[PDB]
Scaffold this active site. Structure first.
Site, mmCIF file in Angstrom:
data_model
loop_
_atom_site.group_PDB
_atom_site.id
_atom_site.type_symbol
_atom_site.label_atom_id
_atom_site.label_comp_id
_atom_site.label_asym_id
_atom_site.label_seq_id
_atom_site.Cartn_x
_atom_site.Cartn_y
_atom_site.Cartn_z
ATOM 1 N N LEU A 191 0.819 -1.203 0.000
ATOM 2 C CA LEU A 191 0.000 0.000 0.000
ATOM 3 C C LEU A 191 0.858 1.261 0.000
ATOM 4 O O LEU A 191 0.475 2.278 -0.571
ATOM 5 C CB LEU A 191 -0.965 -0.013 1.189
ATOM 6 C CG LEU A 191 -2.010 -1.131 1.131
ATOM 7 C CD1 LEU A 191 -2.753 -1.256 2.455
ATOM 8 C CD2 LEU A 191 -2.976 -0.907 -0.026
ATOM 9 N N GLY A 192 2.023 1.183 0.635
ATOM 10 C CA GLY A 192 2.950 2.298 0.663
ATOM 11 C C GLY A 192 4.177 2.014 1.510
ATOM 12 O O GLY A 192 4.280 0.956 2.130
ATOM 13 N N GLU B 284 7.312 -0.669 5.588
ATOM 14 C CA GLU B 284 6.304 -0.751 4.533
ATOM 15 C C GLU B 284 4.981 -1.309 5.052
ATOM 16 O O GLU B 284 4.944 -2.045 6.039
ATOM 17 C CB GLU B 284 6.797 -1.622 3.378
ATOM 18 C CG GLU B 284 6.685 -3.113 3.651
ATOM 19 C CD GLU B 284 7.080 -3.955 2.456
ATOM 20 O OE1 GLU B 284 7.549 -3.378 1.453
ATOM 21 O OE2 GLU B 284 6.920 -5.192 2.516
ATOM 22 N N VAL B 285 3.897 -0.956 4.374
ATOM 23 C CA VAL B 285 2.579 -1.438 4.753
ATOM 24 C C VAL B 285 1.977 -2.232 3.613
ATOM 25 O O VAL B 285 1.934 -1.771 2.471
ATOM 26 C CB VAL B 285 1.619 -0.293 5.119
ATOM 27 C CG1 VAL B 285 0.260 -0.856 5.515
ATOM 28 C CG2 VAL B 285 2.201 0.544 6.244
ATOM 29 N N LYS C 185 1.522 -3.299 8.998
ATOM 30 C CA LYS C 185 2.731 -2.492 9.007
ATOM 31 C C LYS C 185 3.896 -3.369 9.441
ATOM 32 O O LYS C 185 3.855 -3.980 10.510
ATOM 33 C CB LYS C 185 2.557 -1.307 9.962
ATOM 34 C CG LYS C 185 3.755 -0.376 10.079
ATOM 35 C CD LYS C 185 3.507 0.670 11.161
ATOM 36 C CE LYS C 185 4.721 1.561 11.393
ATOM 37 N NZ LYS C 185 4.948 2.528 10.281
ATOM 38 N N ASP D 65 1.735 15.142 13.788
ATOM 39 C CA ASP D 65 2.101 15.148 12.363
ATOM 40 C C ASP D 65 0.866 15.057 11.473
ATOM 41 O O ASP D 65 0.809 14.254 10.540
ATOM 42 C CB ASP D 65 3.061 14.003 12.029
ATOM 43 C CG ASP D 65 3.785 14.207 10.700
ATOM 44 O OD1 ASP D 65 3.957 15.367 10.280
ATOM 45 O OD2 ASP D 65 4.197 13.206 10.076
HETATM 46 N N1 LIG Z 1 0.998 6.221 0.321
HETATM 47 C C1 LIG Z 1 -0.012 5.276 0.649
HETATM 48 C C2 LIG Z 1 -0.141 4.855 2.174
HETATM 49 C C3 LIG Z 1 -1.346 3.997 2.390
HETATM 50 N N2 LIG Z 1 -1.430 3.683 3.760
HETATM 51 C C4 LIG Z 1 -2.654 2.968 4.028
HETATM 52 N N3 LIG Z 1 -3.501 2.746 2.979
HETATM 53 C C5 LIG Z 1 -4.701 2.074 3.109
HETATM 54 N N4 LIG Z 1 -5.069 1.620 4.303
HETATM 55 C C6 LIG Z 1 -4.259 1.815 5.424
HETATM 56 N N5 LIG Z 1 -4.458 1.438 6.684
HETATM 57 C C7 LIG Z 1 -3.369 1.856 7.472
HETATM 58 C C8 LIG Z 1 -2.490 2.489 6.656
HETATM 59 C C9 LIG Z 1 -1.290 3.077 7.087
HETATM 60 C C10 LIG Z 1 -0.464 2.395 8.022
HETATM 61 C C11 LIG Z 1 0.675 2.973 8.476
HETATM 62 C C12 LIG Z 1 1.049 4.279 8.040
HETATM 63 C C13 LIG Z 1 0.214 4.976 7.121
HETATM 64 C C14 LIG Z 1 0.615 6.409 6.634
HETATM 65 O O1 LIG Z 1 -0.122 7.508 7.129
HETATM 66 C C15 LIG Z 1 -0.928 4.403 6.671
HETATM 67 C C16 LIG Z 1 -3.026 2.499 5.312
HETATM 68 C C17 LIG Z 1 -0.307 2.911 4.133
HETATM 69 C C18 LIG Z 1 0.940 3.719 3.940
HETATM 70 O O2 LIG Z 1 1.043 4.221 2.627
#
Ligand SMILES: NC[C@H]1CN(c2ncnc3[nH]cc(-c4cccc(CO)c4)c23)CCO1
Length: 248
Positions: A8-9, A10-11, A26, A108
């Protein structure tokens, strides 16, 4: 048993082999102990849900938000429809009130850390920088610089210690500016910053302020106040005219 479907983005997006329920996981390589502790405290419809963790390295199980991040709903130089911005800001306030109520500051707040579920409900994300600012009903001042420069409150740059709550209020103000104008007003809130100086001298005939209706602009005038002690508080934000204006 969970299959890791995509990054998703590490996640990674994990899908349950039996129920097909999707969660976000995560993965961190070996402070994590604090993030987990704080996450375990959290239970609110505008905060990313924490489901649990497994160790080996470290795994955090988090609510999956299929709508992605608010950042991607913001069109550069334009923003978004004002009614969409108001709705998101309402939900942001809901989440932030909850956090402050349990004595937690996110530290943040920005569109990259504000996720959307399938119904476009906003969820405050990532408590890696968060900290306790109230415990046993006793407030402790902050002194560490944390956050992201375009979103940080001016007192973080100038004062040794500062209150946690006005800092989150400020960053929410910058988020609102971004949602309504599709740009950030300054690189950082310091006097060496021409755009910050201009704002302090009320040149709202300039961008990004020129793109913003007077009603939401009046709210921004009360949020983006340099003195954290004079800055509007959340209870007062909820009384603001634009905050309460019916919109499409
Ligand atoms: N750049 C994309 C981002 C997406 N993010 C997520 N996307 C969809 N569902 C999610 N649930 C939890 C997260 C998430 C977990 C940890 C950190 C963050 C960043 O604010 C999001 C998530 C994952 C990270 O990348």
């Amino acid at each position: 048993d969970w299959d890791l479907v995509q990054t998703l983005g590490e996640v990674q997006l994990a899908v349950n082999r039996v129920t097909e329920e999707a969660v976000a996981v995560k993965i961190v390589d070996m402070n994590i102990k604090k993030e987990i502790c704080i996450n375990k405290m959290l239970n609110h419809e505008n905060v990313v849900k924490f489901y649990g963790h497994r160790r080996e390295i470290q795994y955090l199980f988090l609510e999956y938000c299929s709508g992605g991040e608010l950042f991607d709903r913001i069109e550069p130089d334009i923003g978004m429809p004002e009614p969409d911005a108001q709705r998101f800001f309402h939900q942001l306030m809901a989440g932030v009130v909850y956090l402050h109520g349990i004595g937690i500051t996110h530290r943040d707040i920005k569109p990259e850390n504000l996720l959307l579920d399938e119904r476009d409900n906003l969820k405050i994300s990532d408590f890696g920088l968060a900290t306790v600012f109230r415990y046993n009903n006793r407030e402790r001042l902050l002194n560490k610089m944390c956050g992201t420069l375009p979103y940080v409150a001016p007192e973080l740059l100038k004062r040794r210690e500062f209150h946690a709550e006005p800092v989150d209020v400020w960053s929410c103000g910058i988020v609102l500016t971004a949602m309504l104008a599709g740009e950030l007003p300054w690189d950082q809130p310091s006097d060496s910053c021409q755009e910050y100086s201009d704002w302090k001298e009320k040149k709202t005939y300039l961008n990004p302020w020129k793109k913003i209706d007077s009603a939401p602009l009046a709210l921004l005038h009360k949020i983006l106040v340099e003195n954290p002690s004079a800055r509007i508080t959340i209870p007062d934000i909820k009384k603001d005219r634009w905050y309460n204006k019916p919109l499409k």
